[PDB]
Design a protein around this ligand. Structure first.
Ligand SMILES: C[C@@H]1CN(C(=O)N2CCC[C@H](C(=O)Nc3ccc(Cl)c(F)c3)C2)C[C@H](C)N1C
Ligand SMILES: *[C@@H]1O[C@H](CO)[C@@H](O)[C@H](O)[C@H]1NC(C)=O
Ligand SMILES: *[C@@H]1O[C@H](CO)[C@@H](O)[C@H](O)[C@H]1NC(C)=O
Ligand SMILES: *[C@@H]1O[C@H](CO)[C@@H](O)[C@H](O)[C@H]1NC(C)=O
Ligand SMILES: *[C@@H]1O[C@H](CO)[C@@H](O)[C@H](O)[C@H]1NC(C)=O
Ligand SMILES: *[C@@H]1O[C@H](CO)[C@@H](O)[C@H](O)[C@H]1NC(C)=O
Ligand SMILES: *[C@@H]1O[C@H](CO)[C@@H](O)[C@H](O)[C@H]1NC(C)=O
Ligand SMILES: *[C@@H]1O[C@H](CO)[C@@H](O)[C@H](O)[C@H]1NC(C)=O
Ligand SMILES: *[C@@H]1O[C@H](CO)[C@@H](O)[C@H](O)[C@H]1NC(C)=O
Ligand SMILES: *[C@@H]1O[C@H](CO)[C@@H](O)[C@H](O)[C@H]1NC(C)=O
Ligand SMILES: *[C@@H]1O[C@H](CO)[C@@H](O)[C@H](O)[C@H]1NC(C)=O
Ligand SMILES: [Cl-]
Length: 335
């Protein structure tokens, strides 16, 4: 093989009858999953990949952009008025497959950080059931670390680049908007479970920073979407204040940590650049049961001449959410 890139295609397990809109777009944009797909570990052939220079991330990105533009349509989009009926919405696993001529190579070593030489390399024709979850700060409904928690970064020293933390435990949030404000919402997280995981996070993160005294803090400057944990639940965008996770120390607090949320009608687009307003949340209890499997953080710019390094959660670029699950695939050209 040789390093090359070709516009791949997708594969879904969707249903042709459901009107949940992830299915709808995937049914008429992807083919059925390969019934019998097979992996083959190349006998001691070692290959090196790197996510931050992967093209399927960019290509997958373009997919969900076009998907949402087809799907989540706004009443008004300042980037034009349209129709905005409230629809069903729930992530579906999506696979990606090379066309005739190329093959995806996947890394199987449990300690891989996503940059450098993998030894246990195998060959696939399609990816795995990647769930395209759009969310900020923390990583939702993603994979799971096959060993220790892993810190993924294009360049640890460069602080303008984002840092992804892949958790080996799936700590969990439980967000709800009960019925008769119509926009009051709240997520509940087990305090000691997430804090036992984060006290591990800082200790398996200090090791990359010369045993410098690490420390966590809340976002310093932003536009809600980056400062507040923003995601989509049952078609509604949820802005949730996560100051109780990176500030409520405990590194008298082992109960259910409860964070507040608001349902924002106006949303600064994650796809292009601009605002887009919708309509009120539909009546009835709106509950989503999601898994935190990772977090996105941004280092300090300036904490050089210090004994510390404060970390703040990262947002904006949704490519890193795509990178998090695509950290193990690289498309190669068979020759
Ligand atoms: C061209 C630029 C433009 N962007 C941008 O200006 N912002 C600032 C306002 C908020 C954007 C954002 O993430 N929004 C968001 C919406 C829904 C949900 Cl559910 C979510 F989780 C997040 C990020 C996007 C960026 C990728 N791109 C580089
Ligand atoms: C390489 O990864 C595959 C996938 O699980 C599996 O055979 C095993 O973990 C590794 N193989 C060897 C020989 O260690
Ligand atoms: C996760 O990885 C950390 C290493 O930082 C380890 O201490 C911990 O026991 C691991 N947990 C699980 C459930 O594997
Ligand atoms: C990733 O692993 C490679 C090879 O083991 C190493 O050179 C590199 O420093 C690691 N990167 C991070 C961010 O740990
Ligand atoms: C990482 O960032 C530092 C500081 O900007 C720079 O000196 C270094 O060359 C970068 N690494 C790479 C591989 O470019
Ligand atoms: C959440 O995590 C648990 C344990 O890691 C797993 O069994 C479950 O399938 C996950 N849920 C989703 C929706 O991924
Ligand atoms: C999630 O929160 C709601 C509201 O507090 C609660 O009724 C539900 O039982 C919670 N989920 C679980 C699995 O306990
Ligand atoms: C940090 O301290 C631990 C002591 O538990 C030691 O094992 C490790 O080598 C130290 N690493 C650095 C980078 O100072
Ligand atoms: C989150 O709540 C804290 C109070 O606990 C508040 O100081 C902070 O401003 C809130 N976050 C945002 C983005 O307003
Ligand atoms: C995560 O998966 C669960 C289980 O299917 C689902 O209920 C929840 O809505 C998902 N979270 C998001 C943000 O889509
Ligand atoms: C200070 O930070 C810059 C980039 O933020 C980096 O290039 C430089 O090496 C740092 N200095 C020290 C002493 O770490
Ligand atoms: Cl041999």
């Amino acid at each position: 093989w040789k390093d090359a890139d070709t516009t791949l295609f997708c594969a879904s397990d969707a249903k042709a009858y459901e009107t949940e809109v992830h299915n709808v777009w995937a049914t008429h944009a992807c083919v059925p999953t390969d019934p019998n797909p097979q992996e083959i570990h190349l006998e001691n052939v070692t290959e090196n990949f790197n996510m931050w220079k992967n093209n399927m991330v960019e290509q997958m990105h373009e997919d969900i952009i076009s998907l949402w533009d087809q799907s989540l349509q706004p009443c008004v989009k300042l980037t034009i008025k349209q129709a905005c009926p409230k629809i069903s919405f729930d992530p579906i696993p999506i696979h990606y497959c090379t066309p005739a001529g190329y093959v995806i190579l996947k890394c199987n070593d449990k300690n891989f950080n996503g940059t450098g030489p993998c030894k246990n390399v195998s060959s696939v024709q399609c990816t795995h059931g990647i769930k395209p979850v759009v969310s900020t700060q923390l990583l939702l409904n993603g994979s799971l670390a096959e060993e220790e928690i892993i810190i993924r970064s294009e360049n640890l020293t460069n602080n303008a680049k984002t840092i992804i933390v892949h958790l080996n435990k799936s700590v969990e949030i439980n967000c709800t908007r009960p019925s008769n404000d119509i926009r009051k919402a709240y997520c509940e997280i087990n305090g000691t479970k997430w804090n036992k995981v984060l006290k591990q996070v800082t200790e398996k993160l200090k090791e990359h920073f010369n045993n410098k005294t690490i420390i966590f803090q809340p976002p310093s400057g932003g536009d809600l979407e980056i400062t507040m944990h923003t995601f989509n639940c049952r078609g509604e965008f949820f802005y949730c204040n996560t100051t109780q996770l990176f500030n409520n120390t405990c590194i008298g607090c082992n109960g259910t940590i409860t964070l507040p949320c608001k349902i924002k009608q106006i949303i600064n687009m994650w796809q292009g650049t601009g605002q887009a307003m919708y309509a009120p949340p539909i009546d009835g209890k709106i509950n989503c049961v999601s898994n935190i499997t990772g977090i996105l953080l941004t280092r300090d710019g300036g904490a050089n001449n210090t004994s510390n390094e404060t970390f703040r959660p990262g947002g904006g670029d949704m490519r890193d959410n795509w990178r998090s699950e695509l950290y193990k695939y690289k498309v190669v050209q068979i020759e």
